[PDB]
Amino acid sequence: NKTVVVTTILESPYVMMKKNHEMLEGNERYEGYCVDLAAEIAKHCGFKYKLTIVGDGKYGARDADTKIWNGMVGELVYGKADIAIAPLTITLVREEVIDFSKPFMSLGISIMIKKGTPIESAEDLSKQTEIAYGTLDSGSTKEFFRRSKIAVFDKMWTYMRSAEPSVFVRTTAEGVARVRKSKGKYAYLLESTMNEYIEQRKPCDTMKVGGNLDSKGYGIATPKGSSLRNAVNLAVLKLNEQGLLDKLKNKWWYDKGEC
Amino acid sequence: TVVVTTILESPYVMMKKNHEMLEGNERYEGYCVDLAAEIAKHCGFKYKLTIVGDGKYGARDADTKIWNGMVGELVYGKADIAIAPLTITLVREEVIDFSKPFMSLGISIMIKKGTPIESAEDLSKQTEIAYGTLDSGSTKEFFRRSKIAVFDKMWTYMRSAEPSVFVRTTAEGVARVRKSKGKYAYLLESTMNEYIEQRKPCDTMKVGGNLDSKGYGIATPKGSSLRNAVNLAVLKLNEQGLLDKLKNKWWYDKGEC
Ligand SMILES: CS(=O)(=O)Nn1c(=O)[nH]c2cc([N+](=O)[O-])c(-n3ccnc3)cc2c1=O
Ligand SMILES: N[C@@H](CCC(=O)O)C(=O)O
């Protein structure tokens, strides 16, 4: 078997630089949930591999003018990498150009509050205005609310689009900082995975509340025609059924946690 | 006309009240009935809903190595596609193809209200309250194959338990919980557990969190000309907000409690 080129992304706690990474080389430089995942996938599929960080540090979107895919997805479609093992969301536009395994992690839109905020659900948020709430100013979460035919979510959308000042943010970091500087009066809506992770880091002043508002997954991606597709897919399923993915999630979110 | 295999399971596929006087696809109603319509429309095919012959989900017989249920119907050419609460699993994915999940779920515990049990660990450490699973489905296989201590102990008890803790249909497991005065707890998927919790006589409840994390997919036989279109159609329907609305319509909107 040829050395498999794995593309991945520096996003905590999926892939991070080890403590002494400057004293290390190759795959030993990195650690995290997706580093452990890549080792398990390689073992089950009988390949050796090289972890490479995606050049542009992006996930994969198609430029609407140039029609060029950036990110890990571009690296797959242009033949620059053999497989992407990262927190890459399974979406229609990507599935049209690459193959995804079944999900290795389930996630969805969720509520981030400052600790002690009287909110426990989307329902709770939808029936008041004292606590302002919002999303990234563009992307899937904003559009989820815009599209939603569910009453509580349409109610939330109607509030959010009218709200002044803007309840929207340019970046995830802006949204998190806005929850923290807000004294309980702002809730941020983001993916549960990131929400649960931030819950477990210092300052330790935020928490996740309520069910997930929708249902998405991260998948392992291969270019179309990859001889790895079937085996990768089965390996993800095997690892899930053995409880290994749950184990890794617990490890990287909680065992490594700081709160 | 595509032959669609499915299973009678509330609220996915249900006989309409006036079914004896109805014909074809109009006999049935539910989440998976609505989903079959959307998928067929998106993929541009005609279809007939046919309830699985043996009323099972699909397991490989340990003696004969023959598949039963919906998986059997796909693998032996009795049906072209399965649109049902069919759990995506390793052993099935080896013999048929699944779309991406149209719904997420995990194994959960159903109790008669007031049963002094709140976790799987609670259950494993006592004999007074009997507990079991559906036969021929993924939950039984989850416990059978499990190497996790708590669930291992649970399977050991379950495989030996007298009389049998296993049931043939979900409605049987639920009727058993309701008839047994707290002496029987049922292990079922969170989706169905939550539905029943919101149905009269409102005498059951879900306890603890899910035991695992998984999804239902639409299944096709290997080499099906339908595989790619169906897979993409599920993602499109999810991103449209349509799968969430359908779940709302059949769970929350029809809630009796
Ligand atoms: C929106 S998309 O089409 O699904 N692309 N996409 C992914 O696939 N995975 C992601 C994972 C993360 N993340 O932190 O794990 C973030 N992230 C980064 C900072 N906050 C969140 C963004 C994305 C992201 O944008
Ligand atoms: N959805 C399961 C059946 C229900 C259960 O096992 O609890 C399957 O496809 O096998």
Curated annotation (Swiss-Prot), chain B:
Assigned GO CC terms: AMPA glutamate receptor complex; asymmetric synapse; dendrite; dendritic spine; endocytic vesicle membrane; excitatory synapse; external side of plasma membrane; neuronal cell body
Main location class: membrane
Disulfide cross-links: C202-C257
Domain of life of the organism encoding this protein: Eukaryota
Alphabetical keyword list: Autism spectrum disorder, Cell membrane, Disease variant, Disulfide bond, Epilepsy, Glycoprotein, Intellectual disability, Ion channel, Ion transport, Ligand-gated ion channel, Lipoprotein, Membrane, Palmitate, Phosphoprotein, Postsynaptic cell membrane, Receptor, Signal, Synapse, Transmembrane, Transmembrane helix, Transport, Ubl conjugation
Positions annotated to bind L-glutamate: P85, T87, R92, S138, T139, E189
Phosphoserine carried by residues: S146, S180
Oligomer and partners: Homotetramer or heterotetramer of pore-forming glutamate receptor subunits. Tetramers may be formed by the dimerization of dimers. May interact with MPP4. Forms a ternary complex with GRIP1 and CSPG4. Interacts with ATAD1 in an ATP-dependent manner. ATAD1-catalyzed ATP hydrolysis disrupts binding to ATAD1 and to GRIP1 and leads to AMPAR complex disassembly. Interacts with GRIP1 and GRIP2. Interacts with NSF via its C-terminus. Isoform 1, but not isoform 3, interacts with PICK1. Interacts with CACNG2. Interacts with GRIA1 and SYNDIG1.
Recorded family membership: Belongs to the glutamate-gated ion channel (TC 1.A.10.1) family. GRIA2 subfamily.
Illness: Neurodevelopmental disorder with language impairment and behavioral abnormalities: A neurodevelopmental disorder characterized by global developmental delay, impaired intellectual development, poor or absent speech, and behavioral abnormalities, such as autism spectrum disorder, repetitive behaviors, and hyperactivity. Some patients develop seizures and manifest developmental regression.
Record-given protein name: Glutamate receptor 2
Species the sequence originates in: Homo sapiens
Upper classification of the organism: Eukaryota, Metazoa, Chordata, Craniata, Vertebrata
Gene responsible for this protein: GRIA2
Parent-protein residues present: 415 to 794 of 883
